[PDB]
Design a protein around this motif. Sequence first.
Motif, PDB file in Angstrom:
ATOM      1  N   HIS A 106      32.876  45.500  51.544  1.00  0.00           N
ATOM      2  CA  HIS A 106      33.445  43.843  51.420  1.00  0.00           C
ATOM      3  C   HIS A 106      34.995  43.919  50.967  1.00  0.00           C
ATOM      4  CE1 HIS A 106      33.094  43.794  46.868  1.00  0.00           C
ATOM      5  NE2 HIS A 106      32.539  45.063  47.198  1.00  0.00           N
ATOM      6  N   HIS A 133      36.110  47.553  51.312  1.00  0.00           N
ATOM      7  CA  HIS A 133      35.575  48.672  50.551  1.00  0.00           C
ATOM      8  C   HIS A 133      34.370  48.521  49.901  1.00  0.00           C
ATOM      9  CE1 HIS A 133      36.926  46.322  47.019  1.00  0.00           C
ATOM     10  NE2 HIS A 133      36.428  47.441  46.274  1.00  0.00           N
ATOM     11  N   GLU A 144      37.419  42.290  48.480  1.00  0.00           N
ATOM     12  CA  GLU A 144      37.070  41.741  47.241  1.00  0.00           C
ATOM     13  C   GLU A 144      37.390  40.325  47.111  1.00  0.00           C
ATOM     14  OE1 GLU A 144      36.316  43.492  44.611  1.00  0.00           O
ATOM     15  OE2 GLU A 144      36.853  42.398  42.654  1.00  0.00           O
TER      16      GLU A 144
HETATM   17 FE    FE Z   1      34.465  45.023  45.079  1.00  0.00          FE
END
Ligand code: FE
Lengths: 319, 336
Positions: free
Chosen positions: A138, A278, A140
């Motif tokens: 995802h 990530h 952040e």
């Molecule tokens: Fe994260």
Amino acid sequence: TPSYSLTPAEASAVAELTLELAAAYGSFGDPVLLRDLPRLAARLPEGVQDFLREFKLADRHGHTVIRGHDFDQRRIGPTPDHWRGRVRPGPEFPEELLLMLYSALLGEPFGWATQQDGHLVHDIFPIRSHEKQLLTWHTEDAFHPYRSDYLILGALRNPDHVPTTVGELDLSSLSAEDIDVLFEPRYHIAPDESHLPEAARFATIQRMIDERPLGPLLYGSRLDPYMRLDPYFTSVPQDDTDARRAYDALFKVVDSGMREVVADQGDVLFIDNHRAVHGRLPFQARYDGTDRWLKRVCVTSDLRRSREMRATSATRLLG
Amino acid sequence: TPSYSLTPAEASAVAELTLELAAAYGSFGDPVLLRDLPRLAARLPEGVQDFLREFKLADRHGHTVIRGHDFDQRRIGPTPDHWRGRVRPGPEFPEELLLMLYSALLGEPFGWATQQDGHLVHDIFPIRSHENDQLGMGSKQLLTWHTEDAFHPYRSDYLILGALRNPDHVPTTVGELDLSSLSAEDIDVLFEPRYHIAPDESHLPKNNTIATEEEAARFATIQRMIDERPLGPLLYGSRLDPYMRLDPYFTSVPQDDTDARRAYDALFKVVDSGMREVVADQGDVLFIDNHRAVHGRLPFQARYDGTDRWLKRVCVTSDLRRSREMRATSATRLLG
Ligand SMILES: [Fe+3]
């Protein structure tokens, strides 16, 4: 993907400065330390400062690593059980300051007041309390307008070399039709909890909470776009077939291009939250005090843009 | 309102450093110089660094001035007749480097592609053919106060103005918001999307090209701002100490919105009466917060003899990548 391997002389200089600073200031609770951060980062080895700045200004890579730091395992001590109740700063203070120094070079350190008592430096270690695993990647806080611009991940230890996933966008895999569609406000992205375990402040996200507006998934340049992608919290209207088709193709290009990157002990991984998604890989945790331990600082390029969600002018904490 | 007075010692070190960097770097076309900027700025006197960092972080005052720089008049030379067709960089390169060091402390320097050939540090001196213009290169006409590029989403966060010379002490006008002078109902209205702000003509996508896919997509956001005419607030951020965007000349209050017209008139009156004349004399560097201050300039008679008022100007952004859609490449600091 460019990376920087410190010399022993660089590593020593970094370690020394980190300890000289860990004794000059009590904690991050000192306003003068947060003030001095950019001046202080200027005492880091020139080659390291120049490396980061080139990463920042190039705006081409989703992540970079500075490798070969000297993290004193004896001094740092055992991997803790929990973050709460634990008194800050610990003996790993020097390492946290380093990550804070790197943040001052990329922009500004900020945190979430409801995330880990609102500590500017986040802990990442196995906890038995918060213990068939799915592989999720995802952006952040993809929903949030004031989400991190960069993520700094410093590996204090990673004995079993447990990798971090990180994926960028390959544009040559997408059609011009899909790209244009993704650039348009046709997608809902849901918020996240982090609640429990001031009138104008909290009522800011109430545009995303009450009304629920549609935004784009790609933005910036159309030849080299930024992205905000969290597939778990992403919604498309059923009737919008073009957006569903384009989101599917975007997911497939990003999923299929996911890389495994190991942040070993002595590495600091830098993630561009606008150019890279990530995630975490599942691993067997020992709980003895030898477990994988990373520290994490969120970076905003523009501290003032989030003013309305911040208690005062001074605080770097949102919510 | 805070200021920093340099000691002759500090002014000497600043001067020495600027000369050093002027010799070591070719021009602002060198990407290594732009890269090195913040590290280089760390070589300035520590007081100055602390002062500016405290201004930046305090987020309270609309402007500040660092006074008492040594700007060598003999080295700098005559005030030019025009910015076009000058050897770049000129003899005043050390001063331009100074303002770029300062901008790196506050954020990132950037420019507008249309403005003075895309020079990151640009000139403010009288040009004869511009005498009747209400612009920076003018003189005779009053430059009425405003937030710079109020309409634009990627307008300057800060402005740095360095005075190479000001023989007749022509003041820059700067005004801030006294929030106690406004009623709580008016503030609430100013915070709401009830106002239309017109773009300056240099921002119009029909003005500058455009033509071909790549450049059309570079003005897509501005184009839909013009096509839809979204209404926006004049006050934002914190309701206890708000940021403002106020260009009276480009602001339209919808005729039917009586509450918006009352609150606007109230806001204008407060800012206009609070206007301050700030003299940027020789060796003065003026910092303006574009989110907390408006600024202008009083009319003055030019001489066109090489002795005229000469200022250097740098626009500062807190976030260079926010304007990425409007920049040709990732590396370029020019919008448009
Ligand atoms: Fe994260």
